[PDB]
From a paper:
In this work, we characterize OsChz1, a sole gene encoding CHZ-domain protein in the agronomical important crop rice to gain knowledge about the function of CHZ-domain proteins in higher eukaryotes. Molecular and biochemical analyses reveal that OsChz1 is broadly expressed in various tissues of rice and the OsChz1 protein binds both H2A-H2B and H2A.Z-H2B. A concentration-dependent efficient nucleosome assembly was observed, and this occurred significantly more efficiently in the presence of OsChz1 than in the absence of OsChz1 for both H2A-H2B and H2A.Z-H2B. This observation is in line with a histone–chaperone activity of OsChz1 that facilitates nucleosome assembly. Thus, similar to yChz1, OsChz1 also plays a role in H2A.Z deposition into chromatin.
To understand the molecular basis of interaction between OsChz1 and H2A-H2B, we crystallized OsChz1-C in complex with H2A-H2B, and obtained the crystal structure of the complex at a 2.85 Å resolution by the molecular replacement (MR) method. As supported by the 2Fo-Fc electron density map, residues 432–446aa of OsChz1 are well ordered in the structure. Last, the C-terminal half of OsChz1-C inserts into the acidic pocket of H2A, formed by α2–α4 helices. The side chain of OsChz1 Asn444 forms H-bond interaction with H2A Tyr59 and the side chain of OsChz1 Glu446 is recognized by H2A Leu67 via van der Waals interaction. Our crystal structure analysis of the OsChz1-H2A-H2B complex showed that OsChz1 binds H2A-H2B via an acidic binding surface. Mutagenesis unraveled that the OsChz1 residues Glu432 + Glu433, Glu436 + Glu 438 + Asn439 + Asp440, or Asn444 + Val445 + Glu446 all are functionally involved in the OsChz1 binding with H2A-H2B as well as with H2A.Z-H2B. Next, we mutagenized the key residues of OsChz1 involved in histone binding to examine their function in biochemical assays. At nucleosome level, the OsChz1-H2A-H2B complex structure predicts that the binding is located at the disk face of the nucleosome where the C-terminus of OsChz1 prolongs into the acidic pocket of nucleosome and the N-terminus counteracts with the C-terminus α2 helix of histone H4.
Numbering used by the authors:
A (entry chain D): 60 to 147
B (entry chain G): 25 to 103
C (entry chain N): 432 to 446
D (entry chain H): 59 to 146
E (entry chain C), I (entry chain E), N (entry chain A): 17 to 104
F (entry chain F), M (entry chain B): 59 to 144
G (entry chain I): 25 to 104
H (entry chain J), K (entry chain L): 60 to 148
Write the structure that this text describes.
């Protein structure tokens, strides 16, 4: 459910305004619809694109292979945190 | 700019769409969803002004979607 | 497939 | 070209009262280059064999273009380019 | 702008992302990779600088020279394995 | 009874785009079986010998039954049980 | 569930009821204590609300506890 | 001194009702009473039971004994965190 | 297992608690133990699985087989001590 | 003894 | 800025009161001014003193030099958290 | 208790080259002192708003407050506006 | 004098159901003594060589005295001595 | 005063600071030092006591004696390096 | 001076 975030987005432009138990479920249904449409669109495109990609998984597997011992685990840790900051 | 990116990441990562997802993807996606919600939730209040409430019910969203050209091409006809 | 930053908006919000 | 500037910033966080010669800063810079090459070269070996689709933000943007109509597409492609570059 | 700042970093996420495409390491790069890799290169930079400075002081100096780095690496079990004997 | 589903869920978290053969999944499953046994057996050795009283939830619950009267005990044993369970 | 399970845990080893305590114990205990702190505070509130007030003072708990058969048996008489 | 948490249970059966300068001290006084009562019951019972019990101390001791190196420390870290979540949720 | 989620875990706290009583390891078991132990078994599962996946990729596969697991364990200093030589 | 889950209550007193 | 925190110090003597777009920038300016004064005074005094000081940089260097391996890293970690609690209390 | 930012003051304390080495006391202590001044000053400013009958503070309020306090004026000078 | 009472307190945190003998507590106490000396001796060697100025809460306090006038310095010096004491 | 508690400790930050000055290690001591040093002494104390207690239980006791401490240090790779072999 | 605690305010 994305209802709570929607509430917060409401407040971004309409703080005073409330929202009904059923009218939330409509907002919720839009987000799911468009999540799905875009997700599926993205999938088709991704299946079409066929070029090698480096994501952080590759970096993390590199790091584990090339770096020794606990130094490798410390490094994976700092890397994971840094992507997570950037994410959240 | 708030919305749940880590959650969008979860769903997106699930493998229905792809097995590999860049962390760029769920950030971008979340922000696009969020905009749409903001643009829709704006209009309901505006539409509510000429209904005069401090509340939003399905008709208000219904009013707003239908009156907006872009949005009704994207969404359906609200019930 | 493009991801330039020329696609950013400091322009006014439209209807 | 050189990580020298960033290396120096990391230094002043750790040992604020300690400096570093040219010959030494050069070693440091050289060391960070070598690690990057080892990590990138290995990351690539691992990208290139993997045969499978990947959704990056390039695919999500093109999806927004293909699915969101008009103004919504131009504006949605803004809020998401704004979110992935941390621009302002 | 500010991508590195957003990931809690002093190392340059953008440039590292550029280096990865410039270098033709892969065609397509996920936004996580450069962040992750920058975080890893900083971590190492910081580990090496902490030791080499600790060596500089233990040797009554207030400025790092090549010897200090060489010694710092020799005396660390993990570090030597990435690097080897530092050449001064 | 097998740990394979859990193993496979953990797998999809760390390496979402990599699968695993039957032989390989059976090696994983025995591995966890064998660590559980070792930990369990060692734990038992270490409990067996220890003669000191322990207050677990089972004692707290009996206590509530004993000390709270009627309505109050049956309802306290609900709130506690629920908390312990979820 | 608002009560402080961590604290209850550290009281549970500090008075030497025991030296060994299961992590079930403080969780369960804290839930029970909180139930009691609920079903008392609720009844005080009724007495104030069943008597035109919006503050709880000692008489309300007094009346509440005294009135309840289960509770008076549990905590006895209340002394302002 | 469960003054602040009592405060919070009040706010959720009666939100805009308040509490006394000394009525909180009374309320707090009976949590202590029942804690000490139950705890002492729990104690009598526990001493009386006498069957060996496995708690997380045993699991942790075992993990350290069996697991090697830092692997053992990592596993104790994850163990400990998992219990804390369960406890603090 | 409702409380598996409550601890932050994929592994089944209930079943592990069940196995501890079931296996006659003790009569009484504190609620901390099966939580703790499930976490440990997940940690181990994920450590071995990260490494075996990294092994597979390094060997250009997208699927783990017994050899990959064996290599992973062999090449880790601590894991070998726990398990020994993995047997194919 | 017995931490059975027979002892949950829904909608009582 | 120190604006957000001036905002907060206001509420601990006058919660009823707010503060104008420019009155804040004046409060901000005062803070910078005295900071810069105390700092520069602190600097003169510090330069003058010339005696050896042990800070936690020296403790941390001692620790890495004397303590072995990962034990050293774990201890630097615990040392660094304890100072951070202390400072950020 | 104290709401000033100590982490921040610590990084200004090394960023302006007052010194290269700084004890962790130094920023804690400084932050406390600055915050004391943001307190005392803002106290008077609200009071200036007493004999004005307001629920706001505006430059003139601080200006009054400073200059009336003989202590503060010697510290921050006559307040401009 | 002795770290014993603190060692004991730490002990009850990690192994609440386990005691410690005299000779055992005396070994613990030397051990912490001996580490304290090693770390201190080394730190002073590091301090001694370093020639650079250090700003500590003493230099800040003397500053507040020299720059805040009268009632302002008295009270400032309280608020900071209070904050760095806890 | 609550300096120890403020730092999250059981060991005595105050007395430690006093020892640092009392012992003439330095004239001036920063407030961070005795916080840091106490934290490290606690860490080491707890690492030894965990191992020595785990030794005691494994050896069916409920009370630590010199032997248990010695075994604990002798079978820890890191701890021995610090101490040496523990005596009696 | 030191950080003497005779500098507090009652």
């Amino acid at each position: 459910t994305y209802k709570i975030y929607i509430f917060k987005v409401l407040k971004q432009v309409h703080p005073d305004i409330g929202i009904s138990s059923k009218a939330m479920g409509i907002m919720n249904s839009f987000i799911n619809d468009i999540f799905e449409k875009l997700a599926q669109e993205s999938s088709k495109l991704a299946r079409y694109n066929k070029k090698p990609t480096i994501t952080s998984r590759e970096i993390q597997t590199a790091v584990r292979l090339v770096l020794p011992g606990e130094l490798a685990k410390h490094a994976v840790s700092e890397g994971t945190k840094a992507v997570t900051k950037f994410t959240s | 700019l708030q919305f749940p990116v880590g959650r969008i990441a979860r769903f997106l990562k699930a493998g229905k769409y792809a097995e590999r997802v860049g962390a760029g993807a769920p950030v971008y996606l979340a922000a696009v969803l969020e905009y749409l919600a903001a643009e829709v939730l704006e209009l309901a209040g505006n539409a509510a002004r000429d209904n005069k409430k401090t509340r939003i019910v399905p008709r208000h969203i219904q009013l707003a979607v239908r009156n907006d050209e872009e949005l009704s091409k994207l969404l359906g006809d609200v019930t | 497939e493009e991801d330039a930053e020329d696609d950013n908006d400091e322009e006014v919000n439209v209807e």
